[PDB]
Amino acid sequence: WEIDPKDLTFLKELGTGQFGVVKYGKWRGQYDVAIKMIKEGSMSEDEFIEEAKVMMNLSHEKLVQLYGVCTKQRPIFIITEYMANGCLLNYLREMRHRFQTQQLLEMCKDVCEAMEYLESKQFLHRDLAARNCLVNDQGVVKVSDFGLSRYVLDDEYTSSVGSKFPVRWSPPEVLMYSKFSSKSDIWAFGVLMWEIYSLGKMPYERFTNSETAEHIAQGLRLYRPHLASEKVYTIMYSCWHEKADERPTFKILLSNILDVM
Ligand X SMILES: Cc1c(NC(=O)c2ccc(C(C)(C)C)cc2)cccc1-c1nc(N)nc(Nc2ccc(C(=O)N3CCOCC3)cc2)n1
The residues that touch ligand X, with contacts defined as CB under 6 A, are 14-15, 17-19, 22, 34, 36, 64, 80-86, 90, 127, 132, 134, 144-145, 148-149, 152
The answer to whether 127 and 184 have CB atoms below 8 angstroms apart is no
Q: Smallest distance from the beta carbon of 136 to ligand X, in angstroms?
A: 9
Q: Smallest distance from the beta carbon of 109 to ligand X, in angstroms?
A: 20
Task: State the Cα–Cα distance between residues 188 and 171, nearest whole angstrom.
Answer: 8
Give which of 163, 158, 171 is closest to 217, Cα–Cα: 171
Shorter beta-carbon distance to ligand X: residue 17 or 172: 17
Q: Smallest distance from the beta carbon of 178 to ligand X, in angstroms?
A: 16
127 catalytic? Reply is yes
Sequence-distant (≥ 6) Cβ neighbours of residue 259 within 8 angstroms: none
Residue nearest to ligand X (CB): 17
Query: Angle of helix 182-197 relative to helix 250-258, nearest 10 degrees?
Result: 30
Q: Smallest distance from the beta carbon of 82 to ligand X, in angstroms?
A: 5
Q: Which residues pair with residue 32 across a beta bridge?
A: 26
Shorter beta-carbon distance to ligand X: residue 84 or 217: 84
Shorter beta-carbon distance to ligand X: residue 34 or 70: 34
Shorter beta-carbon distance to ligand X: residue 151 or 233: 151
CA quadruple 40, 46, 47, 49: dihedral positive or negative? positive
Catalytic residue among 127, 137, 154, 185: 127
Known binding-site residue numbers for clofedanol = 80-83, 148
Residue 249, exposed/middle/buried by CB under 10 A (0-12, 13-18, 19+)? middle
* Angle at 191 (CA atoms; ends 187, 193), nearest 5 degrees: 120
Residues taking part in catalysis = 127
